[PDB]
Amino acid sequence: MCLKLNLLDHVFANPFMNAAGVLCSTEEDLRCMTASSSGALVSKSCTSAPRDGNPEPRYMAFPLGSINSMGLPNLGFDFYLKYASDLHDYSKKPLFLSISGLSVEENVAMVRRLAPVAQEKGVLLELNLSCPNVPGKPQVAYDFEAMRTYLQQVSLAYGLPFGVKMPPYFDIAHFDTAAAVLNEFPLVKFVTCVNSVGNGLVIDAESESVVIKPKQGFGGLGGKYILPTALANVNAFYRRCPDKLVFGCGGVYSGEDAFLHILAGASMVQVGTALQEEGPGIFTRLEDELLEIMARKGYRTLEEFRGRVKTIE
Amino acid sequence: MCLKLNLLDHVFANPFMNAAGVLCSTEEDLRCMTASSSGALVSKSCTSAPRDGNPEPRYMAFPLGSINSMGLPNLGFDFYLKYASDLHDYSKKPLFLSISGLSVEENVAMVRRLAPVAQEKGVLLELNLSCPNVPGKPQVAYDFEAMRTYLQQVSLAYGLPFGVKMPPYFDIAHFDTAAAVLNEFPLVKFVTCVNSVGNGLVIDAESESVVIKPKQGFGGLGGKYILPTALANVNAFYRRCPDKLVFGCGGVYSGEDAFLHILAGASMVQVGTALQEEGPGIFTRLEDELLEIMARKGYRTLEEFRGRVKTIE
Numbered sequence: 001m002c003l004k005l006n007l008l009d010h011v012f013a014n015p016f017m018n019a020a021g022v023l024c025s026t027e028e029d030l031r032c033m034t035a036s037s038s039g040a041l042v043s044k045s046c047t048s049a050p051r052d053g054n055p056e057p058r059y060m061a062f063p064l065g066s067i068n069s070m071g072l073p074n075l076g077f078d079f080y081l082k083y084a085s086d087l088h089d090y091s092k093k094p095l096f097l098s099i100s101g102l103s104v105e106e107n108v109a110m111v112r113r114l115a116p117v118a119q120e121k122g123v124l125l126e127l128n129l130s131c132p133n134v135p136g137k138p139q140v141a142y143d144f145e146a147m148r149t150y151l152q153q154v155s156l157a158y159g160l161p162f163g164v165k166m167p168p169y170f171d172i173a174h175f176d177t178a179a180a181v182l183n184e185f186p187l188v189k190f191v192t193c194v195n196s197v198g199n200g201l202v203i204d205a206e207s208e209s210v211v212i213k214p215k216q217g218f219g220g221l222g223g224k225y226i227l228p229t230a231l232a233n234v235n236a237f238y239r240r241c242p243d244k245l246v247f248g249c250g251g252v253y254s255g256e257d258a259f260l261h262i263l264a265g266a267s268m269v270q271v272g273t274a275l276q277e278e279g280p281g282i283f284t285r286l287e288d289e290l291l292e293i294m295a296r297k298g299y300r301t302l303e304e305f306r307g308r309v310k311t312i313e
Numbered sequence: 314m315c316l317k318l319n320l321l322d323h324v325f326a327n328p329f330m331n332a333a334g335v336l337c338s339t340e341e342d343l344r345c346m347t348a349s350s351s352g353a354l355v356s357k358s359c360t361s362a363p364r365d366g367n368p369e370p371r372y373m374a375f376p377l378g379s380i381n382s383m384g385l386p387n388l389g390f391d392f393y394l395k396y397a398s399d400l401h402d403y404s405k406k407p408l409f410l411s412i413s414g415l416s417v418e419e420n421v422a423m424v425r426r427l428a429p430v431a432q433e434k435g436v437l438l439e440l441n442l443s444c445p446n447v448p449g450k451p452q453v454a455y456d457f458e459a460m461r462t463y464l465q466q467v468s469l470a471y472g473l474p475f476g477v478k479m480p481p482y483f484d485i486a487h488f489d490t491a492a493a494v495l496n497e498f499p500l501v502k503f504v505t506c507v508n509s510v511g512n513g514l515v516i517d518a519e520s521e522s523v524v525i526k527p528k529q530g531f532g533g534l535g536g537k538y539i540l541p542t543a544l545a546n547v548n549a550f551y552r553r554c555p556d557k558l559v560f561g562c563g564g565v566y567s568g569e570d571a572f573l574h575i576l577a578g579a580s581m582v583q584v585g586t587a588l589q590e591e592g593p594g595i596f597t598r599l600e601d602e603l604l605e606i607m608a609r610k611g612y613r614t615l616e617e618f619r620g621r622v623k624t625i626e
């Protein structure tokens with residue numbers, strides 16, 4: 001009985017990793033994830049230039065999850081690249097590196113430089129399609145022509161297998177369109193569903209106040225609020241992209257949530273909010289929990305039940 | 314201290330009403346809702362001809378909320394028009410009538426016939442914009458050209474004040490676009506935010522099966538999963554549509570949740586999943602809980618805090 005997986009020409013002890021943004025910003029964070037029993041890790045979505053991000057408070061958590069309008073604080077591409085090329089211990093686990101450029105050109109500039117390191121060290125690219133592009137247009141993955149543009153240019157600039165981080169969709173025609181677009185691009189080998197549930201609003205009753213300062217309180221939603229949404233997207237893309245891997249991300253607190261993500265068709269399982277709340281010891285719990293569920297049902301590998309959610313008639 | 318208010322030229326004993334779809338399909342249901350403490354009620358969204366809906370199971374509820382893909386079962390517009398026309402006791406409370414036709418023409422044909430009875434009795438139209446039109450194109454409120462067309466044609470055709478039921482949005486540019494559209498129409502006097510969080514997927518771990526039979530298990534989300542989404546929407550529309558009312562719908566299980574909806578800017582507060590689960594007694598508890606929070610804070614009227622949510626700095 002075991003959690004092991006081989007995919008994208010890498011070997012993974014288990015299907016768990018941090019989500020981009022959580023416990024992956026600094027060198028201290030990355031060594032922490034690396035020393036965790038996570039099966040992998042992903043570095044904070046980066047821009048060309050270092051970024052302070054937005055004013056605090058900017059993340060908050062509650063029993064049902066979290067809200068965030070961080071404003072993409074990061075140490076800049078040169079730092080994550082250097083982590084990839086010189087600091088990371090690949091004998092421990094594989095590394096994903098997440099880029100989240102503010103324009104198609106920023107994204108092109110970075111991936112061009114990422115290419116040789118990817119080839120030689122084996123770091124794996126996650127391109128973030130949630131990014132805003134021009135303010136007043138929707139984020140890139142909610143604008144299918146912009147998303148088309150970004151994948152042609154990045155596919156061209158990088159010329160290696162990469163993956164993509166998708167915002168959730170809520171309409172069947174949107175699942176169909178977005179997946180048709182992704183299926184145009186053979187080098188996109190994996191799809192991560194999902195990024196935050198966009199622009200919710202938490203209000204505190206006692207103070208009669210919103211709880212995060214940027215954007216009049218509006219922010220992305222993670223955690224228990226979003227599991228079903230995350231499972232629907234994982235499964236929508238698992239079904240429409242037969243030649244790609246889907247990575248699940250969305251309200252994982254427990255081996256049981258990891259179990260459903262996988263039945264839905266998840267290969268890797270990312271933890272954002274619950275990892276922020278609990279800390280990296282979460283990964284041993286998630287492993288034993290998923291193993292406990294497997295034993296009870298007589299599954300010995302992940303691939304016995306991956307993608308095998310049943311329907312009614 | 315009482316929770317009375319006046320709007321759209323009607324008096325309400327309190328801001329509470331059922332959400333469309335819940336306890337409002339048959340004459341039995343509507344009599345029940347009328348005998349309740351709700352300040353108002355709304356009839357099941359209706360089409361010209363009666364409709365069986367989708368195969369069962371089609372609604373499931375769990376501690377954090379609900380998923381549904383009912384398929385718009387209803388007794389057809391002749392029934393609800395006749396309820397509005399001959400059976401409803403307007404001395405008891407105001408009545409809203411939801412219409413949700415499958416095309417603009419079906420919608421035009423229902424509103425013209427409704428108009429006379431609205432004139433005569435004061436039944437209030439809630440036009441449901443979270444309805445698909447065409448298989449393959451997104452639902453109507455996710456297609457701003459179609460949404461403009463329904464608003465144009467219905468406004469022409471009905472020619473009295475009416476309101477619309479919106480699905481949630483998740484992107485700031487879509488709030489701006491959506492609301493710019495609704496502002497084109499002076500007859501739209503209320504906006505109900507929000508309908509279900511579209512196409513989520515609940516999976517059951519023990520049975521490894523989705524839980525509703527239609528749409529491969531995919532369905533609209535309500536309940537605790539959607540409250541911050543409903544709040545962001547109420548507030549986004551409240552701020553962008555100053556000459557309209559906003560009705561809030563989404564995740565109201567308590568007086569507290571109702572209170573956050575009003576601070577977000579809601580005039581009326583609708584209850585779906587929580588009313589499905591607890592029954593119409595829920596209205597007495599919600600009233601008392603809200604009056605209690607008001608008392609403790611020294612609020613005498615809803616007017617005093619409606620739309621008064623604080624931001625930081």
Ligand SMILES: Cc1cc2nc3c(=O)[nH]c(=O)nc-3n(C[C@H](O)[C@H](O)[C@H](O)COP(=O)(O)O)c2cc1C
Binds near residue numbers: 020100222273
């Ligand atoms: C504080 C915080 C920062 C995040 N930063 C990023 C980011 O930089 N890039 C990204 O693609 N996703 C980011 N996310 C989204 C997570 O990767 C994840 O998609 C989302 O939180 C849902 O997972 P959860 O439900 O486990 O929180 C962030 C989430 C949080 C809470």
Ligand SMILES: Cc1cc2nc3c(=O)[nH]c(=O)nc-3n(C[C@H](O)[C@H](O)[C@H](O)COP(=O)(O)O)c2cc1C
Binds near residue numbers: 413478586589
């Ligand atoms: C069983 C069921 C049937 C519904 N039917 C309708 C409907 O016919 N028309 C409509 O506009 N909304 C319908 N809704 C949506 C609700 O009116 C409400 O927007 C949504 O459930 C979110 O509110 P809640 O969080 O209080 O459930 C339905 C919801 C449920 C759960």
Ligand SMILES: O=C(O)c1[nH]c(=O)[nH]c(=O)c1CCc1cc(C(F)(F)F)cc(C(F)(F)F)c1
Binds near residue numbers: 072130132139195
């Ligand atoms: O840094 C973030 O706000 C963030 N938070 C998430 O939950 N997911 C993300 O992918 C990101 C970073 C991308 C991002 C998102 C946004 C948003 F406000 F549209 F959600 C803004 C920005 C930026 F660059 F503008 F600050 C970046």
Ligand SMILES: O=C(O)c1[nH]c(=O)[nH]c(=O)c1CCc1cc(C(F)(F)F)cc(C(F)(F)F)c1
Binds near residue numbers: 358386415441444
């Ligand atoms: O009766 C519904 O399924 C329903 N459920 C909701 O949560 N909100 C609603 O507004 C409705 C009725 C409108 C509706 C929605 C859908 C859906 F699958 F796009 F959500 C389908 C249909 C229809 F007409 F196809 F049955 C109607």
